[PDB]
Design a protein around this ligand. Sequence first.
Ligand SMILES: *[C@@H]1O[C@H](CO)[C@@H](O[C@@H]2O[C@H](CO)[C@@H](O[C@@H]3O[C@H](CO)[C@@H](O)[C@H](O)[C@@H]3O)[C@H](O)[C@H]2NC(C)=O)[C@H](O)[C@H]1NC(C)=O
Ligand SMILES: *[C@@H]1O[C@H](CO)[C@@H](O[C@@H]2O[C@H](CO)[C@@H](O)[C@H](O)[C@H]2NC(C)=O)[C@H](O)[C@H]1NC(C)=O
Ligand SMILES: *[C@@H]1O[C@H](CO)[C@@H](O[C@@H]2O[C@H](CO)[C@@H](O)[C@H](O)[C@H]2NC(C)=O)[C@H](O)[C@H]1NC(C)=O
Ligand SMILES: *[C@@H]1O[C@H](CO)[C@@H](O[C@@H]2O[C@H](CO)[C@@H](O)[C@H](O)[C@H]2NC(C)=O)[C@H](O)[C@H]1NC(C)=O
Ligand SMILES: *[C@@H]1O[C@H](CO)[C@@H](O)[C@H](O)[C@H]1NC(C)=O
Ligand SMILES: *[C@@H]1O[C@H](CO)[C@@H](O)[C@H](O)[C@H]1NC(C)=O
Ligand SMILES: *[C@@H]1O[C@H](CO)[C@@H](O)[C@H](O)[C@H]1NC(C)=O
Lengths: 727, 208
Amino acid sequence: RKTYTLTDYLKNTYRLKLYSLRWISDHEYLYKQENNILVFNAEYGNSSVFLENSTFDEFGHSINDYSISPDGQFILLEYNYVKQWRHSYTASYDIYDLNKRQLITEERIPNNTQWVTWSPVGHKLAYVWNNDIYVKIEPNLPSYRITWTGKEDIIYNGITDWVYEEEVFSAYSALWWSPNGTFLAYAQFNDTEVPLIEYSFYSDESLQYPKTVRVPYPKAGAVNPTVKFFVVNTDSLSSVTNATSIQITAPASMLIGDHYLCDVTWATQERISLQWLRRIQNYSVMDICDYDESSGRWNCLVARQHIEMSTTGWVGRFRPSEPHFTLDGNSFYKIISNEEGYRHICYFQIDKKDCTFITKGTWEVIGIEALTSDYLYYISNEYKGMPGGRNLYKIQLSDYTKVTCLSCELNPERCQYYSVSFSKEAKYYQLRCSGPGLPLYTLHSSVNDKGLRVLEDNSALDKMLQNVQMPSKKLDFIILNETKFWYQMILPPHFDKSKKYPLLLDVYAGPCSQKADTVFRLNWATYLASTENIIVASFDGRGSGYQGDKIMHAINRRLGTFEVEDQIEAARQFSKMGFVDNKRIAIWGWSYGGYVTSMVLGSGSGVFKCGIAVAPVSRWEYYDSVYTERYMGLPTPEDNLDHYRNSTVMSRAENFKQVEYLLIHGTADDNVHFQQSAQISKALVDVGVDFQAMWYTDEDHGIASSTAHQHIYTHMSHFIKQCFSLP
Amino acid sequence: TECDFSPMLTGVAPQVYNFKRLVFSNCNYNLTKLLSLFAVDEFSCNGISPDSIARGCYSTLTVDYFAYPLSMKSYIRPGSAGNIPLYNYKQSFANPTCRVMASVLANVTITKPHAYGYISKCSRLTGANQDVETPLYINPGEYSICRDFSPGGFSEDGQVFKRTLTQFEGGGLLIGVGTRVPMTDNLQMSFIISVQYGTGTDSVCPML
Ligand SMILES: *[C@@H]1O[C@H](CO)[C@@H](O[C@@H]2O[C@H](CO)[C@@H](O[C@@H]3O[C@H](CO)[C@@H](O)[C@H](O)[C@@H]3O)[C@H](O)[C@H]2NC(C)=O)[C@H](O)[C@H]1NC(C)=O
Ligand SMILES: *[C@@H]1O[C@H](CO)[C@@H](O[C@@H]2O[C@H](CO)[C@@H](O)[C@H](O)[C@H]2NC(C)=O)[C@H](O)[C@H]1NC(C)=O
Ligand SMILES: *[C@@H]1O[C@H](CO)[C@@H](O[C@@H]2O[C@H](CO)[C@@H](O)[C@H](O)[C@H]2NC(C)=O)[C@H](O)[C@H]1NC(C)=O
Ligand SMILES: *[C@@H]1O[C@H](CO)[C@@H](O[C@@H]2O[C@H](CO)[C@@H](O)[C@H](O)[C@H]2NC(C)=O)[C@H](O)[C@H]1NC(C)=O
Ligand SMILES: *[C@@H]1O[C@H](CO)[C@@H](O)[C@H](O)[C@H]1NC(C)=O
Ligand SMILES: *[C@@H]1O[C@H](CO)[C@@H](O)[C@H](O)[C@H]1NC(C)=O
Ligand SMILES: *[C@@H]1O[C@H](CO)[C@@H](O)[C@H](O)[C@H]1NC(C)=O
């Protein structure tokens, strides 16, 4: 039969099918079938055409995306999309009436809009343009200007600056509508004293002089952005006087120094929760704020404060978890770490300090998915004690001993990794299985957990793949000091454990990472195992997540140590297994994986022949403050400068004489700056080490443009094949 | 001799939390005259009528005055509290009072402040993790402990202030926030008039 080739991977010849739906009510959802927008009925499965695909091929532009108002009356049309960072972009927008079937032409959302969002009910619009917030009560009426302080690279209203987009909210948007759309809450970010990273962008051949890109970007220990939080009443807006925003100040425990706004969650129509986080991120507070028309302010009662801090590391996995409020808003459920260091659901009263865990065990809750008056729905890795598994559970609120697994036994062979999408009021839910078999999408009704139908079973792909010698995947664990540590291996087809195979260690290994799971993937490793008979292993050592704080917080204040050592040790045990050629063990990684790869290669352990680092961190003082300081604290003599200096890649330059190294970086990387690899090469040059290198002009951290993506994997494949003496 | 309501219209109008007070004794006043310089929006009295206030004989006539936007009219009213009566100015009702909400007229010649400003946070901080927060509130007629931070106003909306409290003041940290309300076309003010009826020989009657 055939094998899964590099061309198959680069040309996407074996496609995974998806089933992306948008719930619009408690029983209906939108879905795109052959470019039409269809509205489906959850209970019956019938569908009408919501929007005929021919509706806008007379529009004059290409639609990048669309957004339908909650009441169904209007569709927001996105075109002229221009990507900025990981989540940010600008676009032109047209609104289109769905009963009159006509394009609104008056009082239009301007070109180069930074963000747009419908109110959660009805059809109000809030958008951000030139760093200021505007509100349209009706699609054809004029806009009310909420903010006037907006200013490029300095003041951000309703949108995030670079570091808040990347490391805090994972979003460009900093707008939070109240549940019924009365209030619009928004953050204001201030980058006034934040230093700028600068780098060249070469652009098209026709550009004579390169551009210099300048982004406000706080590297470790540098001056951070500041933040203020506001709420505006969108129902009492005046076309004659300037809008009034009420400021919700951070609690005084935060104002004494540097801090972040790290969570925003509306509790009720007149109650908002905010979570703040000190710049030393082992201390956070939640504030609960009620609207008070009488006194014209948002009162945040001190007695309603909830302090969350950590004694072994930082708070949350990457940030304090979001609360899920009961309907009346007087109590809420929140994932927090227990006394054993495991993360479970805790039950809070808004005015009571102590909380009550409703789950426990040596496993973890991944996320709270839905809340009804009777049941709390969550995802966890409890099943068979596999940290790399995900299942849907519901727990009865009247009796915490009644826990039901809703996904475990549906198809235990094919499906061990689940996510879920609930309808409104959680009357229906879609289940999405990602492995270890081909992905499978089903729909269920909540009232009696009945399976209604299969939405997508990837049977097309299944038929295609049987003519192909596909690799298999082994998920298991080894033991280090009476502790289970999980690994996975992508094994070549017809795997003969009496043969010796070369091994490529696929590493990431950042804090709370997980590279050993049950997820089905069709990627580069698939080609390496299927065509080149390479074993591709990954290993979750110390610092990895979803296994309790004792593992995760192990690398606290000491990045570049245990997580690095544990990758070397795992490779040693792999080479002892008998089917691994120990003269041909390589290692490769991206971003944090690039750092670990490099640190491993420079350790002089002798275990690895060659390695590839793509866009690596090389020195933690080079990386942004929020991510870095979360794990390392501040780079000062009073804090943690010693570990900052001892954990660079440049420090280990001498040891690279023992290995073949390939260093790759995009020149337009706004995330892990080219500087980082630039310093690695300089240190290797200064010490006489030969190595391979590759820059990618105007590529960012993803190196994901069509041509660049194909080029780097083609290049890396040559490198691996040559290193492994494959012809 | 005549009552001198001059100082409350010369110089720069003080902010609400930094109110200035004129106390008159043995002095004859024209209230109608003083009120003529303003466009009055609210005239709420307590323990006395807006007619009697301009015609009565008093032992003392006290006026607290400050800049204040009329958009915040409702937030300085009794019992409805309130960033203003908590941290800035709390009206006393121990004596007959009158609260006047007014805009100064166009060709009066006042030099107004850059903006209106009030304190919207004032707390003491103690504890090992610096997190026992105790909001500090004023008694009527007294100045906030957070007033000294920036008596002239706030150049920034949501401006933060920090200070160590002396052993005497109770120790710990003092935290204050001030908010900024943009200045209006015509200066908007507020003055609180208070009278007493003392037995002593000396009065403040109106002018004949
Ligand atoms: C965004 O943050 C910047 C940087 O923190 C803010 O700029 C600063 O605002 C202060 C106001 O507190 C300016 O003032 C100084 O205050 C002291 C008196 O306490 C005095 O010594 C100085 O004469 C001056 O008045 C400061 O110059 C200014 N710094 C700048 C502009 O670089 C800015 O206010 C913030 N903007 C927003 C919208 O939050
Ligand atoms: C799905 O089917 C239901 C019927 O099973 C549709 O509801 C009916 O629609 C017809 C025609 O519009 C009406 O005359 C009936 O009165 C409706 N009956 C009920 C019980 O609703 C429904 O509109 C369909 N939905 C979609 C999205 O196709
Ligand atoms: C709403 O606020 C804006 C911004 O403060 C006002 O516009 C400014 O007015 C000042 C007055 O000197 C000018 O210097 C600025 O150039 C104006 N524009 C901007 C963008 O700041 C506006 O007048 C206010 N509107 C109302 C109705 O009061
Ligand atoms: C958050 O972490 C910091 C840094 O580890 C803690 O501050 C240090 O605590 C140790 C022992 O508690 C002291 O010996 C150091 O002097 C402290 N400062 C530094 C710079 O290390 C802090 O205690 C932690 N906060 C909480 C609430 O646990
Ligand atoms: C529009 O939908 C019809 C439905 O049959 C389909 O045949 C056609 O190819 C679609 N057009 C585009 C451009 O997707
Ligand atoms: C966006 O730009 C185009 C081209 O300059 C222009 O024709 C169009 O009117 C603009 N749209 C708006 C809403 O200003
Ligand atoms: C939305 O909630 C606010 C605050 O409780 C309330 O005043 C308003 O009437 C509500 N509007 C609707 C349409 O329910």
